[PDB]
Design a binder for this molecule. Structure first.
Ligand SMILES: O=c1cc(O)n([C@@H]2O[C@H](COP(=O)(O)O)[C@@H](O)[C@H]2O)c(=O)[nH]1
Ligand SMILES: O=c1cc(O)n([C@@H]2O[C@H](COP(=O)(O)O)[C@@H](O)[C@H]2O)c(=O)[nH]1
Lengths: 257, 257
């Protein structure tokens, strides 16, 4: 039997970051993660401010941001606190442990100083998680493992997926869930976030495949939808965000009771 | 029957970037790629200048560089031309096509404006290559696909590896080879670069596993060794570079005739 996000937030094994996330989801009635896939800091900040009330999470690709500075991240954190959402840097760490720990803590981006969550590919094996955790645990951060991908020809299937789940179970002090197309783990302490989501059928020219919030949350058992162009490419991004929020929320409520 | 690097450089299907690489290798008698895994721009530049004559390639993690600017990359290019080596940004693109193309061209790093080669994970499926190629082909750049990893518990094995090779064959206009632990493709137009290389047996604390140049080039059929700490952590990095160059070169010559 399924538990609400409010109840999952209180589970004995829950990670502090997941708990915070689960409580604001319940509070705000949102399971929408905005993929803020933009290249200007002013658009990112105007989107985070305007859409902040509608989202549980803001997902960034900081290496696209033409005018990144740490001060932009300071501003984004202010918005994140004001409106109550997490910040998720979609960096997809996918190197050896020794390398990823420097990528996570250092360089120009100082990802770990502002990102509540990051993600990693499990291909390098479990050293990728061990490496990130040496920076991440002291900073009280969490990590998502990419168990499945939305894109055409994805190799993240079968035993690869089983292996991402195992890696997650075995690093539960730092790993809080998955990027996947569906529920991959039966343990309610793990979050499932699903990208490749649009209201209408379709894809793009570069291998992206879309499914609807009702399919993803309702039929496939995921918890959160990640949506980029479905919102960002709309004229009214607030209204688009609201239409995604309400679809994912109701899909959730319907799966629950 | 094996061909020299000079002869491979002239093969009908050879990529222009591979050709340039193969010719300077032969010219300089080096198949060593330095992994310049440092956080200061001045150390990177002093290493590239001092070690430039000993290497065919300089591999960077620009997102570790505490004081990155594009001007540092201008300086590195000057050294690369002066001493004749390629620059390889080890970014491990591992997202959907639409995302990777922005990561490759834009943001603060403008990777494609200075990097002769980049690499990518094949997990997202072939859209990761299609996405990079839309930036990379106009800029006359090449890409390496990660077919195998050196680290403990790596999932890049079996059919995953077979799939990286297929992806490579089918994008030969942009993909010039592989990061692997061994020869994975029988086609001499593809380069094999192998990391996880040290003179002495061992590893690190975060899942890295080492093999020697003779094992890697000589027994396993690779073309180029990538070496980080084996050189960078030595007192005399020039002498260390020379000891790696001469091991990899002779291993090559011995496999040849
Ligand atoms: O399997 C995956 C994993 C991802 O992170 N993503 C990311 O999620 C977002 C999807 O964006 P969009 O809704 O514009 O297609 C992109 O930022 C992409 O990098 C994905 O599309 N598929
Ligand atoms: O399978 C792989 C693929 C890599 O790119 N690398 C990279 O190669 C270098 C190995 O460095 P070192 O020689 O210090 O262990 C690192 O920069 C690492 O990110 C690797 O070690 N193993």
């Amino acid at each position: 039997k399924e538990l609400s996000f409010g109840a999952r937030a209180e589970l004995p094994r829950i990670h502090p970051v997941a708990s915070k996330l689960l409580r604001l989801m319940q509070k705000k009635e949102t399971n929408l993660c905005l993929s803020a896939d933009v290249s200007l800091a002013r658009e990112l900040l105007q989107l985070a401010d305007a859409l902040g009330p509608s989202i549980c999470m803001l997902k960034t690709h900081v290496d696209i941001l033409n005018d990144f500075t740490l001060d932009v991240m300071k501003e984004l954190i202010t918005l994140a606190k004001c409106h109550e959402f997490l910040i998720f840097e979609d960096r997809k760490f996918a190197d050896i442990g020794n390398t990823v720990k420097k990528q996570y803590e250092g360089g120009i981006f100082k990802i770990a100083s502002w990102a509540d969550l990051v993600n990693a590919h499990v291909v390098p094996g479990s050293g990728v998680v061990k490496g990130l955790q040496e920076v991440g645990l002291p900073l009280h951060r969490g990590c998502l493992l990419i168990a499945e991908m939305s894109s055409t020809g994805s190799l993240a299937t079968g035993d690869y997926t089983r292996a991402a789940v195992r890696m997650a179970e075995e690093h539960s002090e730092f790993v809080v869930g998955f990027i996947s197309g569906s529920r991959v783990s039966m343990k309610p302490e793990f979050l499932h976030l699903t990208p490749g989501v649009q209201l209408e059928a379709g894809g793009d020219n570069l291998g992206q495949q879309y499914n609807s919030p009702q399919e993803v949350i309702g039929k496939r058992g995921s918890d959160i939808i990640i949506v980029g162009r479905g919102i960002i490419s709309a004229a009214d991004r607030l209204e688009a965000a609201e239409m995604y929020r309400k679809a994912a929320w109701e899909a959730y409520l319907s799966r629950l009771g």
